[PDB]
Structures are given as C-alpha cells and as structure tokens.
Ligand binder design. Structure first.
Ligand code: CHL
Ligand code: CLA
Ligand code: CLA
Ligand code: CLA
Ligand code: CLA
Ligand code: CLA
Ligand code: CLA
Ligand code: CLA
Ligand code: CLA
Ligand SMILES: CC1=C[C@H](O)CC(C)(C)[C@H]1/C=C/C(C)=C/C=C/C(C)=C/C=C/C=C(C)/C=C/C=C(C)/C=C/C1=C(C)C[C@H](O)CC1(C)C
Lengths: 212, 148, 203, 225, 230
C-alpha cells in the first residue's frame, strides 16, 4: 500500500501515485477532472518553487540581520532598497511585469499546446524550449547540469524531494507571514526568543493567538 | 460577540443535523405517528424546561445586574455574573434570602423567598418596565405548570 | 456482551431498525470507554488528598481536585513547568493521535497494522472485537489465556467501571454543593454521621 | 528457555539466536529483520559505553573522592598535566578521532566483512565471526574460543545492568547532589531519612553554567526547582 | 574497483574506470549524461591547473618577497603600466586563448593548425590533453601522470580555498598561519575561535577591511559569506 495522508481511508479514485508527492489528500475532490488535476499539478509546482526561493531569501536575510551587518528585516527591505539607491518604484514594477509577462506567457501557451514553443519562433532556439513533462521544462536552459536525462529512478527521487521541500516551504512562508502579524518582530528573532525561554515564550503567550 | 459566535456555531449544527437526518439516519413513519410522546416531550421538555432554565438565568444574572444598574452605578463597576454565581455573599448582600441557600425550598418554607419572587403589580417607576422579580416568579410558576 | 443484567427499560439495545450512533456495537463500546476514563479519573481525584493526608507528598500540593487548574475561577496552581495553555496544546496533539487512530480501528477493523508508524505495527493489529484490542502492549502479560477466565475479567472491568462512573458523578455533585474535597467529605461524614449528611448540608 | 514473565507466549521473531533473549518486546520494534540487526548493534553500543561509564564514575569515586563527576567536565577541574586547556582543540581531537572510528564501524554495518583489512599496512586483518564482535586485535588475549555464547550472554546482561545503574547515577546525582558512593553511605547514615520520598522535587543543578567563552544550557530530567 | 572512496561501497552505474582518477564519487549523480560528463571533465582539469599555478604562486610569492600580503597584492605591485592597460592586455590575450581552447572543445580536431605559420600542426589528441608543444617530453608514463595531475590538482583546489578562508579569519599568509598554529596547536584551530550554542553564537572578527580606496574609486571588499561563519 501507499502511505496515505490518513492511515485507514482508501485514497480517492483520481489519485493513483504516478505523480510526485501523491498521498491521496483531496477531501473536497477539487482535482476530479484530469485536465483540472493537470493544471493544479503545474500550480502546485510553481507555488512551491517560488515559496522555496522566497523562504531561502527570508532566512538568509534574517541571519544577516541579527548579526550586526545592517540588513533590514524582510518587512522593511522593499522600502529601504527603493528609497536608498535611487530607484523609482513604478518603473521597476512595470519592468517586472514586462519580463515576467513574457516568460509566464510562454509557459501558459506551452501548457495549452504542449509542444508548440519548440518551433523556432523565438530568436533561434529549438528543442531548448520543448517541455519534458507537465511542469518540468527540462532543456539546456532549465536543466543545465543535466539531471533529468540520466538515472531515471534517481530522477524520480529528485521529483519526490522537490515536491516535499516545496510544500514545507509554502507552509514556512505562511509561518513567516502570520508570525510577523502576531509578534511584529523578525522571524529569527522569534526563533532566538523561543530558544531562550521555550516554556514561557510561544504562541500561547502573545495574547493574539488564543484570545481566551 | 461571544453570543454571536455561539449562534453561528448552532446554525452550522442545525444544517448538519438536517443533512444527517435526511441522508444518513432517516426516521421511519411510525416514529412520526407517535403524537402522544411528542406532546409529552414538547410540553415538558421544550416549554417547561425552557421556562425553568430561563428562570434560573433571571434569578442569577438578570435580577442583580439590573438591580445595580437601576441603583445608579455605571455598568463597568458592576461585578461579572460568574462572580454572582460563585460568591454567595454578594447575593446575600443584595437579597438576604440567598444567605439561607436552598434550605427553604426543600422544606416547603417558601415564604422566605419573598425578596426575589414577588407579586407586586404595576411597573418599575425608575425604569418603565415590569418588575423582574415578578418575571422570575412567573417563569417558575410556568415551568411547574408545564412540567405537570 | 458483558455486564448484561436484564436492565434497560427505555429500550436502546434493540438492533431492529437501528442506525447512526445508537446501536449495540457503539453503545457498548461507549460504555467501556467511559468506564475506563472514569476509573482513571476517580483515582486521580482522590489521590492528592489521601497521599497528602498520609504525609507522603508536600503541602504545596494536596489541593482539591477542582483546584488543579481545570476551573481557573475555582482556583489555579502556579508551579507547573509552563502555562496551562502550553499544557493544553500538548494535550490536543497527543490525544488527537491516540483517539483518532482508535477511531480508525473502529471504522476499519484491522487497518492499523499496515502503514509505517515507527515500526509500531504488530502492536496495533487489534482483534476481532473493537473494545478489547489486545496485542503485545494492550495485553502485556497474557491475563487469563483462556475463555472461561476472560469473561470474568471483562465482567469485573465493567462492574468496577460502573461503580467508578457513579463515584465520579458523586465527586462532581459534592464539589458543587459543599465546596470541599471528597476525602474531606469522607472525614466529615465519618466524624458525625447524624449531624453531617446531605440534608444537614442544605444550608 | 526461561521467559521474561510467567505465562507469556514468546513472539515469533525472537527464537534464541541472539544472546540475552528473554522474548521481551512489548512494542514489537524488532519485527523487521534489518531493524532487529540495527537495534542489536544499538544495544551492544549502549551496553559497552555504559559499562565504561559506570566503571568510570565508580573508580573516580574510589581513587579521588573530591572529583564530583557531574562537575568534572569544567575546564578547571582537570588533572595534573593541564588545567586551563583550550576546549576547542580538545573538541577537535575528539571530533576527528571518533569520526574516523565510528564511520569505519558504520561501514562495517552496511557491508559485512569489508573493512577488515588494514588500509595502510596491508597485511593486517581481523576476523569477525558475528556482526558486532570483531575479534583479532580487539581480542589481544584470546578469551573467545570457548563456545563464545555464554560470554555473549554475560556481556549483554552485565551491560543492561550497567545502563540501568548509570541512569541511576545521573538521576540521583541530580536529585541529592552527591555521587554514587556518597549517596549509598548517606543512605546508610539513616535509612528513613535521606530517601527518594524527600529529596526529589529539588533539582540542585544550575540553569546555565559558563565555560571559558560560551554558556552551556543545562537541563534536569524533571522540573523540580 | 582499484580502491574507491569510502572503501567497500559500490560505485554509481555511470562511473566505470575509463577516466584517470575516478573513484565513484558522485552521490548527487551529476555525471549521468555523457554530454555533461565531457564538459565537466574539462572543467575539473582546467580548475585543477589554475589552482595549482595559483597555489605555487602564493607560496613562492610569500617565500621570495615576504611581508607582501597576497590578499592585498593588487593594491600593491602597481607599476608604470596603468591598471587599465594591464586589464586590456589580459582581456584580449586571455580572450584569444580561451576562445581557441573552447573551439577545440565544442568542435574537436579543428584548431590544431597554427594560423600564421602554416607549416606547424598540432597532432591528434584526446580532449583536454593537447600535447605537442604543450608537452615537450613525458617523464614516466601517461596513464599514471594523469592520475598524479588530477590528485595534485584536487589537493591544490582545496589548498586555495583553504588559503582564502585562512586569510579571511586570521589575516596572514599561509606559511605564517602554519607558524602561528605550530606555536599553539591547542589554542589556534577553527574550533578554538568560534562556536554556536543554542544560547549564543560567536564568530571570528573579520580582519580584512571594508571598501578599499585603490585610486579614489573604491573597491568594495567583502569576505566570502560573512554571515554564516562558524
Ligand atoms: C581573477 C582572479 C582574481 C582573484 C581571485 C583576485 C583577488 C582579489 N583581488 Mg584582484 N583578483 C583577481 C584578478 C585581478 N585583480 C586585479 C587587481 C586588484 C586590485 C587593485 C585590488 C584587487 C583586490 C583583490 C581582492 C579583493 C577583491 C574583492 O573584494 O572583490 C570585490 C569586487 C568584485 C568582485 C568586482 C567584480 C569583478 C581579492 C583577494 C583588492 C584588494 O586586494 O584589497 C583588499 C584590490 O584593491 N585586485 C587585477 C588587475 C591587474 C586582476 C586581473 O586579473
Ligand atoms: C531544493 C530542492 C529541489 C529539488 C530536489 C529539485 C529537483 C528537480 N528540479 Mg527543481 N527547482 C527548485 C528546487 C528543487 N528542484 C527551485 C527552488 C526552483 C526554482 C528556482 C526549481 C526550478 C526548476 C526548474 C525550472 C527545473 C527544475 C528541474 C528539476 C529536476 C531536475 C533538476 C534537479 O534535480 O535539480 C537538482 C537540485 C539539487 C540537487 C538541489 C541543490 C541545492 C541547492 C544548491 C541549494 C542552494 C541554493 C540556495 C540559493 C542557497 C528535479 C526533479 C528541471 C526539470 O524539471 O527537469 C525536467 C527544470 O526544468 N527545477
Ligand atoms: C452539500 C450537501 C448536500 C448535497 C450534495 C445534497 C444533495 C441532494 N439533496 Mg440534500 N440536504 C442537505 C445537503 C445536501 N443535499 C442539507 C444540509 C439538508 C437539510 C436542509 C438537506 C435536505 C434535503 C431534502 C429534504 C431533500 C434533499 C434532496 C437532495 C437531492 C436533490 C437536491 C436538489 O436538487 O436541490 C438543490 C436545491 C438547492 C441548491 C436550493 C438551495 C436551498 C437553500 C437551503 C436555500 C437557502 C437560501 C435562502 C432562501 C436565502 C435566500 C434569501 C432570499 C434571496 C431568498 C440531492 C441528492 C431532495 C431529494 O433527494 O429529492 C428526492 C430532498 O427531498 N436534501
Ligand atoms: C426534550 C426533548 C425534545 C425537545 C427539546 C424537542 C424540541 C423540538 N422539537 Mg422535537 N421531538 C421529541 C423531543 C423533543 N423535541 C421527540 C421525543 C420526538 C419524537 C416523537 C420529536 C419529534 C419532533 C418532530 C417530528 C419535529 C420536532 C421539532 C422540534 C423543534 C420545534 C421547533 C421549535 O420551536 O424549537 C425552538 C428551538 C429551540 C428550542 C432551539 C433548541 C434546539 C436544541 C437542539 C435542543 C434540541 C434538543 C434535542 C431534541 C435533544 C436531542 C438532541 C440530539 C443531539 C440527540 C424543537 C427544537 C420540529 C422541528 O423543528 O424539527 C426540526 C419537528 O418537525 N420534534
Ligand atoms: C434551572 C435553572 C437553575 C440552575 C442551573 C440553578 C443552579 C444553581 N443554583 Mg438555583 N434556582 C433556580 C434554578 C436554577 N438554579 C430556581 C428556579 C430557584 C428558585 C427556587 C433557585 C434558587 C436558588 C437559591 C436560593 C440558590 C441557588 C443556588 C444555585 C447554585 C448552586 C446550587 C447548589 O447549591 O447546589 C445544587 C447542586 C447541584 C445542582 C448539583 C450539580 C451537579 C454537577 C453539575 C454534576 C457534574 C458532574 C460531572 C461528572 C463533573 C465532571 C468532572 C470533570 C469532567 C471535570 C447553582 C449554580 C445557590 C447558590 O449558589 O446561590 C448563588 C443558592 O443559594 N438557586
Ligand atoms: C431538535 C430536534 C431533534 C429531534 C427530534 C431528534 C431526534 C433524533 N435524533 Mg437528532 N439531532 C438534532 C436534533 C434532533 N434530533 C440536532 C440538532 C443534531 C445535531 C447536533 C442531531 C444529531 C443527531 C445524531 C448525530 C444522531 C441523532 C439521533 C437521533 C434519534 C435518536 C435520538 C436519541 O434517542 O438519542 C437520545 C439522546 C441522547 C442520549 C443525548 C442526550 C444528551 C445530548 C447532549 C443532548 C442534550 C440536549 C439538551 C437540550 C442539552 C441542554 C443543555 C444543558 C444540559 C446545558 C432521533 C430520531 C441519532 C440516531 O439517528 O440514532 C437513531 C444519531 O445518531 N441526532
Ligand atoms: C504520578 C503522579 C504524580 C504527579 C503528576 C506529581 C506531580 C508533582 N509532584 Mg509529586 N509525588 C508523587 C506523585 C506525583 N506527583 C508521589 C507518589 C510521591 C511520593 C514519592 C510524590 C512526591 C513528591 C514530592 C516529595 C514533591 C512532589 C512535587 C511535585 C510537583 C513538582 C514536580 C516534581 O518535582 O515532582 C517530582 C515527580 C515525581 C516524584 C514523580 C515520579 C514518581 C511517579 C511514581 C512517576 C509516575 C508536581 C505537581 C514537588 C513539589 O511540591 O514541588 C513544589 C515535591 O516537593 N511530589
Ligand atoms: C572545479 C570543481 C570540480 C569539478 C567541476 C569536478 C568534476 C568532476 N569530478 Mg571532481 N573534485 C573536485 C573538484 C571538481 N571536480 C575537488 C576539489 C575534489 C576534491 C575534494 C574532487 C574530487 C573528486 C573525486 C574523488 C572524484 C571526482 C569526480 C569528478 C567527475 C564526476 C563527478 C561529477 O559529475 O561532478 C561534477 C562537478 C560539478 C558539477 C561541480 C559541482 C560544484 C558545486 C555545485 C559547488 C558546491 C560545492 C560546495 C561549495 C562545497 C565546496 C567544498 C568546500 C570544502 C569549499 C567530474 C568530471 C569523480 C571522477 O573522477 O569520476 C569521473 C571522482 O571519483 N572529483
Ligand atoms: C558590490 C556590491 C556589494 C556589496 C557591498 C555587498 C555587501 C554584502 N554582501 Mg553581497 N552580493 C552582491 C553585491 C554586494 N554585496 C551581489 C551582486 C551578489 C550576487 C552575486 C551578492 C551576493 C551575496 C550573498 C550570497 C551574500 C552577500 C552578503 C553580503 C554581506 C556580507 C559580505 C559577504 O558575505 O560577502 C559578499 C558576498 C559575495 C558572494 C561576494 C560577491 C560580491 C561581489 C562584490 C559582486 C560583484 C559582481 C557585481 C555584478 C559587480 C555584505 C553586506 C552575505 C550576507 O551577509 O548575507 C546574509 C551573503 O550571504 N552578498
Ligand atoms: C443505564 C441506563 C439505562 C437506561 O435504559 C437509560 C439510562 C437511564 C439513560 C441509562 C443510564 C445511564 C447513566 C446513569 C449514565 C451515567 C453516566 C455517568 C455518571 C458518567 C460519568 C462519566 C464521568 C467521566 C467520564 C469522568 C472522567 C473524569 C476524569 C477523566 C477526570 C479527570 C481529572 C482528574 C483525574 C483530576 C484532575 O484534578 C482534574 C481532571 C483533569 C478533570
């Protein structure tokens, strides 16, 4: 048997175990249609990748912030980076939308037509924008070291590791958000605060978490 | 606010109850056709025990708090009702019958409860409403009547 | 089947046209669970008073059972290693695992010996019945080892449990009315029987 | 075979091959055979380190009764040749040496009979008859040719006893503030005084003791204050 | 199977024994693709050779001309040559050489001919080992010297990163650091300078300064990965 998200319940019919991180977790049956499930697969992978990258950013910047280097904490870095160098806010946002819109649109229309961008329309590139699977766009640009086309079972292991770490990162970033909303301080500052007095500094003491 | 949250929770309870009794455990006919049991349970349980419970709430919260509010003290200084449940001596300050506890009730000496179960008639002249002691006495008699 | 004493005037053990949470195979299970928790709780409510009266624990403890921190209005105790909320979160998580897995054994019998749980799998197989799992840990020593003795132990479990349930209701009622501990009530009533009763303590 | 209790059926995966086998496994953690092997190695390691620790506390109490073992790691209590040694370098020595030996042994776990050969002086070797009992240079005197089984049982039994007595050493070391022999003699002072009934609840250990540059956090096993 | 790292273990299925100095060290599986493995082979060779030359440079630079802090040396040696002119010469010359070598990589057997003097032609080779005028003679045999060069190279790369951190913690050269360590082995290690405890964490102070004013326009000088030191 597979390990299920809830030992004892059989897994739903549309979830089999061919995917990565497949634990049969779908109580609302949101992914019953195969196209909808395929789209949600891509959604989970993208959210996970941005979450991993973001939480790495938060943790590293906070490590640099507690030690006396002069880094701002993550709720202040936007203001001080825009303010301190010279940068006009809206032009930066607009260029963000330019580049992100270009690449993200390429991804969208590669989902609609699965092998369309490998035609040569972009400057000269062929078979380096052809996708490998759903949400795994491995070529020379996106898998430069070349891990996807060797050691297939070990590659399945890498898929499993990616999905697990991504989910952990997503709930980690949610942790950063709600944690800052509750305590109003930096995250690794909270880690050191809880690590100094574990029995008396936790969520059951802020007065905001449990209002009883 | 707490009452609001409680109301919402009871609402979810009711919708789940409806789903349960149509789809999972649906009664047969002859459950419904026992009108005599339904009469007993409604008359006793719903009307009667509701009256008795609300009499309890009036006697232990609504009489003293309104006595203080009509006495003139602002509402914040008034003790919270769980202090009225837990501390007998505050009730003994307000209505001295409570200093004797529930001994008058079980020995049929009900005449000593004339401080918070009254029969005065008209209105509260400082307020414009009915006397709440009458209201509590009323629900007590109602509950005895319906439970009988 | 245990504890069947010819009782039940209101008629709840009729299998015919039954369902939901009122059926023979859930009401009996509920009886045994309530019996076990009631035994445990009864001993727990008595123990600090008797241990403190015999002088075995110090007098920082020897507090009445409703003053542990269960009802913070009635009196709490500072000196635990954390706040009662921090205790309560641990309670939520641990009891969640235990009670929830127990539920999974009731709904799907035998389905608790497959998925990896740190190797604790031969212990949680259960048995044919659902209120008496057994196994190497719920039945450490093989108590009885037969059939003629097993019914006797089940029956004694049931009767002790029923006695415990009535006892625990007694502790609750007494703690409401007289406001003292249960061992305090035993001492006061064994002092003066006629002058200490329920009817003398009508105030 | 005597069991671990009267009238208890033995499990099916505990037959009598391993030593000290009483058929006692209420949690059934040794159902998987690979698990049984790895946990056997765990029992042997814990037994042997614990026997060393018990003899250590005992002989330090016999020889020089001033050394309170629970405070013996502080960098000023150490003996003759050095008394202000830098704990960083000492940790470096221990790290490299123990890493070498334990990584080597783990490799003996994963591949049975693969690290017997001396890597430098290649004409050296130890024959291990069973996994976890090397022999050879580890048996310089050769007491392991008579049936080897009763010596397995004696080793494992004494080790279990040593593990329990060492946790006794630490527990009553944190309760009553004294070493093992001091606690035994103070219990022989008066038996009814100086009991577990009175001294527990008081955990005499500090919150965080300072070493040369850092502050180690310290914990007792139960909240006593 | 000769020896392998962590002996007794099993090598990965893609490493067999064709290459010099392969011992089955790929837990990440970064050499599954042959087309990757050729590029990474060339990468290892080139990094090894640069590191060997640089480590010998640092050692001999300290030995012959002591009290010239190699980590500062750019702020030092400045000559009648302008730094812009030096940067230009380096840019054009190194650009030529690297482009030629990379053309040999991606298209084998093409750049073997001298462009100017059309008589000389480099003989056929195996990639990464050109030969010819690049190696006048072999002392010993080839297949052993390949192993020796890879070993000395990997050791040299580790030696240079050791040099960088050994400068960014202490503030001295390599041999001077060795003298300091032999002066007090128990008290001068990396474990003897910094440590992390759940209570507190302490790191060595950075000896190396901030932005360095070379010629007015300052060069910001950070230490590598400042915030994660012990
Ligand atoms: C490519 C190999 C190479 C390496 C490893 C170094 C190493 C170094 N140079 Mg050096 N250099 C190198 C090439 C060259 N340097 C110089 C001329 C200088 C000068 C004038 C200075 C250095 C400095 C430095 C040091 C600090 C640089 C820094 O903080 O980076 C941060 C800046 C960048 C990463 C810019 C991006 C490129 C560091 C040890 C500085 C120093 O020693 O002060 C402590 C210094 O003042 N270098 C020239 C021109 C001939 C080079 C051309 O090959
Ligand atoms: C760290 C977890 C992790 C893991 C195990 C994987 C695993 C995988 N990714 Mg992936 N990915 C991740 C994070 C991860 N990713 C993140 C955060 C991003 C966003 C930048 C991506 C973006 C991405 C793309 C765009 C593509 C992949 C692809 C792949 C597949 C082959 C490449 C590979 O194995 O990388 C191996 C990765 C590691 C061994 C991790 C090394 C750890 C790094 C060095 C951490 C340090 C960096 C940090 C800044 C500090 C494989 C399933 C390719 C694919 O699908 O092939 C068909 C592909 O096209 N991933
Ligand atoms: C999500 C749970 C769920 C699901 C899937 C179903 C599914 C079903 N139910 Mg069921 N039911 C449920 C919950 C559910 N019910 C609950 C909670 C109750 C208790 C209230 C019932 C009570 C119930 C009865 C009594 C009956 C069904 C019936 C049915 C069947 C047909 C339903 C249909 O076409 O009407 C769909 C109808 C709607 C979507 C209308 C919505 C009605 C809501 C409550 C109105 C509330 C809005 C309110 C007016 C506010 C508006 C303000 C103003 C603008 C007007 C179908 C199998 C019928 C059946 O099987 O036929 C033989 C049937 O007789 N169910
Ligand atoms: C003491 C027992 C008792 C009580 C309190 C009630 C109360 C009620 N019954 Mg009722 N009933 C009973 C016994 C009881 N019944 C018996 C024995 C039978 C079988 C003969 C029935 C058969 C019956 C039918 C067929 C119907 C009712 C209905 C109603 C509701 C009328 C609406 C109203 O004005 O309520 C005012 C609102 C309140 C008082 C809010 C309080 C509601 C909470 C949940 C108290 C309910 C107590 C609950 C019945 C005890 C069992 C709970 C369950 C978890 C086991 C009311 C809630 C009617 C109804 O509304 O159906 C939903 C209806 O159609 N009953
Ligand atoms: C129906 C509503 C109702 C309710 C809820 C109450 C409730 C109460 N009245 Mg009351 N009262 C009522 C109607 C009501 N009355 C009416 C109508 C009158 C007019 C006749 C009075 C007249 C009256 C007087 C004159 C006095 C009270 C008093 C009291 C309080 C103490 C009762 C007592 O002495 O012990 C009675 C004993 C019990 C009710 C037994 C309780 C048993 C508990 C709940 C069982 C719990 C067991 C369980 C296993 C515990 C779990 C353990 C574990 C899980 C933690 C109590 C809060 C007394 C008081 O405190 O004054 C402030 C008092 O002096 N009342
Ligand atoms: C108000 C109308 C009403 C009526 C007439 C019924 C009637 C019925 N329900 Mg039902 N139910 C209701 C509301 C109602 N329910 C609500 C609102 C819910 C959601 C919580 C449920 C949830 C529910 C479930 C989940 C189940 C039933 C079941 C049953 C059946 C057997 C009940 C029985 O004998 O148990 C006797 C009841 C008890 C032993 C429980 C008494 C104690 C609980 C806590 C109720 C206390 C009520 C009281 C008002 C609380 C006062 C508060 C005070 C103490 C402070 C019967 C057909 C069962 C069934 O179908 O089996 C045949 C069943 O499985 N119902
Ligand atoms: C098993 C139930 C139980 C529980 C939950 C407690 C809980 C407590 N005891 Mg305690 N105690 C118990 C049984 C128990 N006791 C028994 C049976 C004895 C007699 C040996 C004692 C003797 C005792 C003393 C002498 C003292 C406490 C103290 C305390 C408090 C601080 C914790 C501590 O240091 O105790 C240590 C914990 C134990 C001794 C429990 C281990 C033994 C049982 C059998 C494990 C099961 C805490 C409220 C201390 C206190 O009042 O702090 C202010 C204190 O001075 N207890
Ligand atoms: C410049 C870096 C570099 C590169 C590109 C290679 C490349 C190669 N080595 Mg190699 N090696 C290096 C440095 C390098 N080596 C060093 C310094 C050592 C000594 C520790 C070794 C020891 C070594 C052994 C023992 C073996 C190899 C083997 C191999 C080959 C197959 C493994 C593979 O695919 O890795 C590809 C390499 C990379 C993709 C580079 C990864 C760089 C990562 C992403 C940076 C993160 C490193 C991290 C910061 C840790 C730093 C170390 C710290 C102490 C500073 C491949 C040609 C195996 C072989 O010969 O089989 C053919 C083999 O058996 N190497
Ligand atoms: C040239 C301007 C500049 C300056 C003054 C700083 C300053 C700082 N960086 Mg930094 N950084 C820069 C550019 C710069 N950065 C760029 C362009 C990158 C991307 C390659 C990084 C990547 C980077 C990382 C990954 C980290 C820092 C960290 C730090 C802090 C500690 C110094 C350190 O660890 O080494 C600096 C780190 C390097 C990798 C050195 C390379 C920087 C050179 C100068 C970039 C030159 C290229 C550019 C295009 C011209 C310090 C405040 C560390 C820190 O405290 O975070 C918590 C840290 O972890 N930086
Ligand atoms: C039989 C019959 C028949 C017919 O037909 C019908 C009818 C009549 C309905 C029926 C009857 C019934 C009955 C009588 C019942 C009863 C019950 C009870 C009392 C329970 C309890 C029950 C009870 C219970 C559980 C309890 C439990 C308890 C506990 C846990 C406790 C705990 C605790 C402790 C330790 C101490 C501390 O400090 C506190 C706490 C923490 C709190």
């Amino acid at each position: 048997v597979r390990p299920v998200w809830f030992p004892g319940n059989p897994p739903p019919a549309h979830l089999d175990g061919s995917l990565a991180g497949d634990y049969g977790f779908d109580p609302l049956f949101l992914g019953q249609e195969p196209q909808t499930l395929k789209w949600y697969v891509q959604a989970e992978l993208v959210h996970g990748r941005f979450a991993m990258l973001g939480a790495a950013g938060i943790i590293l910047t906070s490590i640099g912030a507690k030690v006396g280097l002069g880094f701002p904490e993550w709720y202040d870095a936007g203001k001080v980076v825009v303010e301190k160098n010279n940068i006009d806010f809206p032009t930066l946002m607009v260029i963000q939308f330019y580049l992100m819109g270009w690449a993200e649109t390429k991804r969208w229309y590669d989902f609609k037509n699965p092998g369309s961008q490998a035609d040569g329309s972009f400057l000269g590139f062929t078979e380096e924008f052809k996708g490998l699977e759903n949400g795994y766009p491995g070529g020379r640009f996106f898998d430069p070291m070349g891990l996807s086309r060797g050691d297939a079972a070990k590659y399945q292991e890498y898929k499993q590791k990616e999905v697990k770490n991504g989910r952990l990162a997503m709930i980690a970033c949610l942790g950063f958000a709600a944690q800052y909303a509750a305590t109003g301080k930096g995250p690794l500052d909270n880690l050191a605060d809880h690590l100094a007095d574990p029995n008396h500094v936790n969520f059951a003491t802020n007065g905001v978490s449990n209002p009883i | 606010y707490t009452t609001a949250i409680g109301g919402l929770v009871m609402a979810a309870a009711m919708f789940f109850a409806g789903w349960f009794h149509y789809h999972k455990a649906a009664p047969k006919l002859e459950w419904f056709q026992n009108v005599e049991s339904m009469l007993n349970h409604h008359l006793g349980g719903l009307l009667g025990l509701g009256s008795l419970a609300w009499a309890g709430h009036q006697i232990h919260v609504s009489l003293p708090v309104n006595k203080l509010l009509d006495a003139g003290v602002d509402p914040k200084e008034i003790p919270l009702p769980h202090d009225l449940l837990l501390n007998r001596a505050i009730m003994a300050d307000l209505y001295p019958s409570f200093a004797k506890g529930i001994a008058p009730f079980f020995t049929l000496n009900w005449s000593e409860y004339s401080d918070f179960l009254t029969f005065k008639g008209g209105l509260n002249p400082v307020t414009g409403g009915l006397w709440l002691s009458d209201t509590a006495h009323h629900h007590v008699a109602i509950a005895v009547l319906f439970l009988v | 089947l245990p504890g069947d004493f010819g009782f039940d005037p209101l008629g709840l053990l009729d299998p015919v046209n039954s369902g939901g949470f009122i059926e023979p195979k859930w009401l009996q299970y509920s009886e045994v669970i309530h019996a076990r928790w009631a035994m445990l709780g009864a001993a727990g409510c008595i123990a600090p008073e008797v241990l403190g009266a015999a002088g075995l624990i110090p007098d920082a403890t020897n507090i009445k059972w409703f003053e542990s921190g269960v009802i913070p209005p009635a009196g709490s105790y500072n000196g635990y290693w954390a706040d009662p909320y921090t205790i309560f979160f641990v309670e939520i998580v641990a009891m969640q695992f235990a009670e929830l897995r127990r539920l999974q054994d009731f709904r799907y019998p035998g389905s608790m010996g497959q998925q990896y749980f740190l190797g604790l799998e031969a212990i949680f197989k259960g048995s044919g019945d659902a209120a008496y799992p057994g196994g190497p840990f719920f039945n450490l020593f093989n108590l009885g080892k037969t059939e003629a003795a097993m019914k006797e132990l089940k029956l004694k479990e049931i009767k002790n449990g029923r006695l415990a349930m009535l006892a625990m209701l007694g502790y609750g009622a007494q703690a409401v009315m007289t406001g003292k501990g249960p061992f305090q009530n035993l001492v006061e009533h064994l002092a003066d029987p006629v002058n200490n009763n329920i009817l003398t303590n009508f105030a | 075979r005597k069991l671990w209790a009267p009238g208890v059926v033995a499990p099916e995966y505990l037959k009598g091959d391993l030593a000290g086998d009483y058929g006692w496994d209420p949690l059934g953690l040794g159902a998987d055979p690979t698990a049984l092997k790895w946990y056997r190695q765990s029992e042997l390691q814990h037994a042997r380190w614990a026997m060393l620790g018990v003899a250590g506390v005992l002989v330090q109490e016999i020889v020089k009764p001033d050394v309170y073992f629970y405070e013996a790691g502080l960098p000023q209590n150490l003996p003759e040749p050095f008394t202000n040694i830098n704990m960083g370098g000492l940790l470096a020595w221990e790290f490299i040496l123990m890493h070498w030996v334990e990584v080597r042994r783990w490799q003996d776990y994963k591949n049975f009979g693969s690290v017997n050969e001396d890597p430098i002086f290649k004409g050296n070797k130890v024959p291990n008859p069973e996994m976890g009992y090397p022999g050879g240079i580890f048996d310089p005197f050769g007491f392991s040719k008579g049936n080897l089984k009763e010596l397995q049982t004696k080793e494992i039994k004494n080790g279990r006893l040593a593990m329990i007595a060492y946790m006794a050493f630490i527990l009553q070391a944190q309760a009553t503030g004294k070493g093992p022999l001091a606690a035994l003699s103070a219990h022989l002072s008066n038996p009814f005084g100086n009991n577990i009934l009175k001294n527990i609840g008081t955990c005499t250990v500090p919150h965080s003791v300072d070493v040369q540059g850092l502050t180690i956090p310290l914990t007792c096993l139960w909240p006593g204050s | 199977s000769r020896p392998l790292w962590l002996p007794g273990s099993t090598p990965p299925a893609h490493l067999k024994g064709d290459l010099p100095g392969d011992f089955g060290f790929d837990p990440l599986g970064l050499g599954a693709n042959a087309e990757s493995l050729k590029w990474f082979k060339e990468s290892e060779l080139v990094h090894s050779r640069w590191a060997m030359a640089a480590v010998a440079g640092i050692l001999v630079q300290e030995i012959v001309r002591p009290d010239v802090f190699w980590y500062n040396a750019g702020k030092e040696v400045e000559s009648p040559l302008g730094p812009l002119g030096l940067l230009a010469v380096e840019f054009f010359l190194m650009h030529w050489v690297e482009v030629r070598r990379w053309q040999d990589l991606r298209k084998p057997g093409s750049v073997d001919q001298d462009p100017i003097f059309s008589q000389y032609k480099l003989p056929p080779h195996e990639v990464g080992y050109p030969g010819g005028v690049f190696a006048p003679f072999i002392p010993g045999d080839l297949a052993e010297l390949k192993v020796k060069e890879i070993k000395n190279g990997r050791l040299a790369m580790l030696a240079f990163v050791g040099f960088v951190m050994a400068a960014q913690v202490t503030g001295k050269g390599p041999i001077a650091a060795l003298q300091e360590h032999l002066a007090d082995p128990w008290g001068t290690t990396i474990f003897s300078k910094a440590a992390v405890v759940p209570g507190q964490a302490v790191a060595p102070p950075c000896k190396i300064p901030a932005s360095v004013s070379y010629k007015g326009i300052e060069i910001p000088t950070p230490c590598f990965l400042q915030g994660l030191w012990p």
